[PDB]
Amino acid sequence: ETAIPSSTRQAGIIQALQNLGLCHILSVYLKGLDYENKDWCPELEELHYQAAWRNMQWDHCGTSYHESLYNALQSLRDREFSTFYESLKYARVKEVEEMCKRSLESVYSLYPTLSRLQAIGELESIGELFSRSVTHRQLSEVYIKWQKHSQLLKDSDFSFQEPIMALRTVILEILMEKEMDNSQRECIKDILTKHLVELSILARTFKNTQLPERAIFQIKQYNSVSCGVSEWQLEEAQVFWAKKEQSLALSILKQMIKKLDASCAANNPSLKLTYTECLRVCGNWLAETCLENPAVIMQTYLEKAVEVAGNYDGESSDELRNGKMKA
Amino acid sequence: AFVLRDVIYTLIHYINQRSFSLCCDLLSQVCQTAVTYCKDALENHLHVIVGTLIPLVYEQVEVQKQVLDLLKYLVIDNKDNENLYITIKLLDPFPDHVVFKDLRITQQKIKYSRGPFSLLEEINHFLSVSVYDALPLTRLEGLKDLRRQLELHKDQMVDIMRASQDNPQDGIMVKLVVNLLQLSKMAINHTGEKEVLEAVGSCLGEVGPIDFSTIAIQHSKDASYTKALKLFEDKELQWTFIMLTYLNNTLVEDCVKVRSAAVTCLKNILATKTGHSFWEIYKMTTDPMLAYLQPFRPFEGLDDINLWIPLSENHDIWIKTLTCAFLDSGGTKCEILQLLKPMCEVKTDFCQTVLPYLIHDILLQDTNESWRNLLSTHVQGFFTSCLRHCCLDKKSQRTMLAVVDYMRRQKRPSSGTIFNDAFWLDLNYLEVAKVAQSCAAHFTALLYAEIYADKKSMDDQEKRSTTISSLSEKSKEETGISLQDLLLEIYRSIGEPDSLYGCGGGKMLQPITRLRTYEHEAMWGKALVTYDL
Ligand SMILES: [Zn+2]
Structure with a gap:
């Protein structure tokens, strides 16, 4: 349709591309917009800076919220905190005054402002952590704080949660980029993988399959496969299952089972619990799709997961009891 | 015719x-004498004229x-x-000019004597x-009427x-499509090609991409050649027949050097006992070739890495030097396989068509696989190059x-099956399959891939005395080319x-396979996402 004015037609196209997982295509399309149209309206300029910071397009050069966020990210990447803090303060003031100038009267309008302020606060916490040095305990307490607040955001909309997850992913990628080779790099990589998998489930529960695939792509970009498969292979199988690729998901999960039952060796309780989860998922998938009679799938997967969980329950951890209950 | 055809083709x-x-007077006199003193002199070499x-x-x-005088003489x-x-009755119409009204009416009387031809009758006539004429240039009017x-x-x-x-x-319809394709391939390197190619292209443009429910292309061949090779029970006789037929075909060209070498080769083979035995056998068939030919009655030089691949826009030189190097060596034994040097030195197609024959001739007399190992290693080196x-x-x-x-297709002298026949030389067929893939010969590439997989399975079985993923990784480790990807490419392009x-379609994690499956299933929505991602 071309009857829609270009003031909002381009914004709708860009938003659709952002929600469709297309980043390089959006960047090239916006470059073509810059080529064909010289002047920039505030709306498309804001979308340009949003895609610039979201895609880590650092080559591209009052200010809007996305412009301030991109400037703060660049200042953090340049080890400049004075302009980083000034930009965040300006963004907070601009957002507060813009929110309070209107008539309000609607709770739903507060959610975008609260999400933007939360993103600014998280960037402030990251700047404080990255001010002088990074430690494993500080990274762990930051991640657990983020997970606890995301638990508080379970009932929130995905539209109001996606920018938070995107900013967290960008922050973790910056930390990985500017981390010297040591044991801290492995901890940051593990935290990044855990964040990406939680983003995968978060987007999966909202009937979205593009962002989870992008998260799995980043996981495969950083992490590498080995003899002992991690939990992100299982998350990849779940993503492919959500993508209606049942055959591929089943083949991947069966390969994971074949690797685990052949090279388990009781190496890790986390591997034991993800083996139980994989067996339970495989049994449920077989039961739902009915490619085999229940006689063999039940014995092969369900009782196997039950006995695996019950044979090593000497710790009585919550992460083990919930898995046993689910099995 | 022999003299009549030589003079008419020279003219x-x-x-x-x-x-x-x-020239017109001479050709009118020769055709007048042919139609006066004979009834079948112009039965075959008339359609060109x-x-x-x-x-x-x-x-x-x-x-x-x-x-017009010659046309009215011939048609009246x-x-x-x-x-x-x-x-x-069997010749192209002349819709060219209005002044040919007499030719048109006299042509249509005989052509439509039994009635008005339908579309199927027109296709059969075309x-x-x-097949009756080997010159596509003279068939332009036939293409226009088609x-x-x-x-x-x-x-x-x-x-x-x-x-x-x-x-x-x-x-x-598919027979006509392949017939036009064959005619275009014949006229791919002949004068006036821009008109015949346009005519055949327009003829194929008049019919859309109709699903013929067939995948294989069959190249129709004249029944006389097939029956002659069927009744030739000796490989020597078959080689003599195919060589003499090619010599006759290459004897009617404009170049004088090629026909001088062809006539010398005709006397060379016809003067030997192989030629005499050929005529003994060949004396029962009803072929005017008898009338046409009636008046006419070591390893040191082959081992060179540069000789096998001197290929920098020098294909003609490469084939010529290969044929010369093979013929001058002592491997060749047959007189017909030895005396063809002067003519093959100037004909490009002859080297291409006789190289497999001389290779088989040399390998027949090979002892202790002396030639077999050297040829297999050199051929494998060529494919790696x-x-x-x-x-x-x-x-x-x-x-x-x-x-x-x-x-x-050559039978092994020792007892064996077609599987042993396909391994005449010590080669691994995966590389040849990838070469055929690069040459758009998907069927041959698939057959070679199956042959190589069978060979690998047999080798593993005898070593012990094996899934597709295992074969693919073994090929990737040793050869460097993955069999699974090669098979996927063949099964996609076919x-x-x-x-x-x-x-592995629908069950392979690799993005290349996922993209191929997405494009195969027309799932462009997820295909675009995967391409960007
Ligand atoms: Zn090259």
């Missing part, structure tokens, strides 16, 4: 190279008058001949004259294919693929509906 060569009045002077109407008034004064009735017949009678192509559903492998990243011209690859195809899933 038509002089006419086509543009004394023209003298007829179809050649038609474009000469747009010339000087003397040329036009002579052209010789239309009563019983033997020439079929020849005059195919009959297509185009008009298809355009005007588009309604008649529905019930023809409806009745052809029972036997789709003998489709008339082609697979190098080296930008070799496709004529060399298709030449070696033709050699491999011919050698695969167009078969459900063949990519067997190699």
Whole structure:
């Protein structure tokens, strides 16, 4: 349709591309917009800076919220905190005054402002952590704080949660980029993988399959496969299952089972619990799709997961009891 | 015729190279004497003459008058001949100029004697004259009338294919398509190609990409050659027949050097006991070749890495030096396989067509696989050179693929099966399969891949005395080319509906396979996302 004015037609196209997982295509399309149209309206300029910071397009050069966020990210990447803090303060003031100038009267309008302020606060916490040095305990307490607040955001909309997850992913990628080779790099990589998998489930529960695939792509970009498969292979199988690729998901999960039952060796309780989860998922998938009679799938997967969980329950951890209950 | 055909072809060569009045007078005298003293002298070598002077109407008034005089002589004064009735009935129409009204009416009387030909009858007539003549240039008018017949009678192509559903492998439309393709391949390196290529392209443009429900292309061959090779029970006799036939075909060209070498080779083979035995056997068949030929009655020099691949826009030199190096060595034994040097030195196609024959001749007399090991190593080196990243011209690859195809059909002297026959040389067929993939020869590549997989399975079985992933990783480790990807590419480019899933389609995590499956299933929405991601 071309009857829609270009003031909002381009914004709708860009938003659709952002929600469709297309980043390089959006960047090239916006470059073509810059080529064909010289002047920039505030709306498309804001979308340009949003895609610039979201895609880590650092080559591209009052200010809007996305412009301030991109400037703060660049200042953090340049080890400049004075302009980083000034930009965040300006963004907070601009957002507060813009929110309070209107008539309000609607709770739903507060959610975008609260999400933007939360993103600014998280960037402030990251700047404080990255001010002088990074430690494993500080990274762990930051991640657990983020997970606890995301638990508080379970009932929130995905539209109001996606920018938070995107900013967290960008922050973790910056930390990985500017981390010297040591044991801290492995901890940051593990935290990044855990964040990406939680983003995968978060987007999966909202009937979205593009962002989870992008998260799995980043996981495969950083992490590498080995003899002992991690939990992100299982998350990849779940993503492919959500993508209606049942055959591929089943083949991947069966390969994971074949690797685990052949090279388990009781190496890790986390591997034991993800083996139980994989067996339970495989049994449920077989039961739902009915490619085999229940006689063999039940014995092969369900009782196997039950006995695996019950044979090593000497710790009585919550992460083990919930898995046993689910099995 | 022999002298009659030699003089008529020399005269038509002089006419086509543009004394023209003298040449027309001489050809009129020779055809008058042929039709006066004989009834079948012009039964075969007439269609060229007829179809050649038609474009000469747009010339000087003397040329036009002579052209019309000869045409009215041939279509009126010789239309009563019983033997020439079929020849005059089977020739291209002349819709060129209005001044040919007499020719048009006299042509349509015999052509439509039994009634008005339908579309199917027009197709059958076009195919009959297509195989009757080997010169596509003279068939331009036939292509034009075929185009008009298809355009005007588009309604008649529905019930023809409806009745052809029972036997789709003998489709008339696909037979015409391959016939036009063969004619274009014949006229790919001949004068006036821009007109014949346009005509055949327009003829194929008058018919859309109709699903013929067939995947294989069958190249129709004349029954005389097949029956002659069927009744030839000796490989020596078969080699003599194919060589003498090619010599006759290459004896009627405009170049004088090629025909001088051809006639010398004719006397060379016909003067030997092999030629005498050939004529003994050949003396029962009803072929005018008898009348045409009646008056005419070591390892040190082959080991060189540069000799096998001197391929920098030098395909002709490479084949010429290979044939010369093979013939000068002591491996060749047959007189016909030894005395062909002077003629093959100047003919490019002869080296290509005789290289498999000389290879088989040398390998027949090989002892202790002395030639077998050297040839296998050199051929494998050639294929590795082609697979190098080296930008070799496709004529060399298709030449070696033709050699491999011919050698695969040769029976092993020792007891064995077709599986042993396919391993005449010590080669691994995965590289040849990838070469055929680069040459768009998907069927040969798939067959070679199956042969290589069978060889690997047999080798593993005898070593012990093996899934597709295991074979793919083994090939990647040793050869460097993955069999699973090669098979996926073959099964994708071949167009078969459900063949990519067997190699890993829908069950492979690799993005390349996922993209191929997405494009195969027309799932463009997720395909674009995966391409960006
Ligand atoms: Zn090259």
